[PDB]
Amino acid sequence: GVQVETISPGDGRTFPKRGQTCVVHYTGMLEDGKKMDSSRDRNKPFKFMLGKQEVIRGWEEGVAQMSVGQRAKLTISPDYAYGATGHPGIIPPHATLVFDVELLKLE
Amino acid sequence: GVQVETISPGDGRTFPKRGQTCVVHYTGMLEDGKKMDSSRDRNKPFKFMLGKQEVIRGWEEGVAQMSVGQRAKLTISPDYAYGATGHPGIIPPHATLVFDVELLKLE
Structure with a gap:
């Protein structure tokens, strides 16, 4: 999964909805x-x-949990990132990723 | 594209074939x-x-010019890699990559 750890609060009511x-x-x-x-x-x-599965599962799911103007640290497990095979050449197998994300706005 | 620079020679006859x-x-x-x-x-x-396009164009196109036992430095331009968009979260846009590859064997 993805562990979200808030750094800065958003508006707490405008969360990303599908589409x-x-x-x-x-x-x-x-x-x-x-x-x-x-x-x-x-x-x-x-x-x-x-x-649209444009980004990895933990990248997207962690963001769906955020409100506009928020900034948090998302700790993504390998199964939510690139899994057991990873992305050969750039990402090794079984890699846990840590993203610092800020939801600037929705549209 | 890709630039192949030999670090160590191969047999010079056993080149890869499609499949x-x-x-x-x-x-x-x-x-x-x-x-x-x-x-x-x-x-x-x-x-x-x-x-089978299982790797980036530069990765594969460099090994296609290598003989079994050869080890080379492949300098892959952005267009033969992740391009102008890159791979968000992992590799930035317009990124030139460098791979040290050794063709152990064919099968």
Whole structure:
């Protein structure tokens, strides 16, 4: 699963519903906090629609639990990330990921 | 595309053919040499079917020019990897990758 740990509160009432487009600022890391990719380095918010499996399960499900303006740390288990085979070349097998995500807005 | 630079020679005759299974030991890293994943960390060779697009275009197209027993440094441009979009959370946009690949055998 995905363990969500709030860093900054959102509005607590505007949560992502299926079909909407999530505008976020993320930072994907390895279990120990090793930075891999951050949309903050490009100053461009990343968009993804709920129900389209555009991102990994824990990435999306962790966000569905957040309200607009919130920023939290999402600890994703391998089964919710890239599983037992991982993504050969970039992601090793059985990898737990830690994302720092901020739900900028919905659309 | 991909640039093949031989670190160690192969037999120079046994080249991969569509359908065969390529057995390799790799180490994928970014353009500056930062390591991401290595099958050697698990002492388990990696396998992929030639022509089945089971890996990024540069990964596969480099091994197709390698003979059994050869170990080479493959410099893969962004277009032959994850492109302008990359792979959000793992690899950033316009990323040149560098793989150290060893063609252990064909099967």
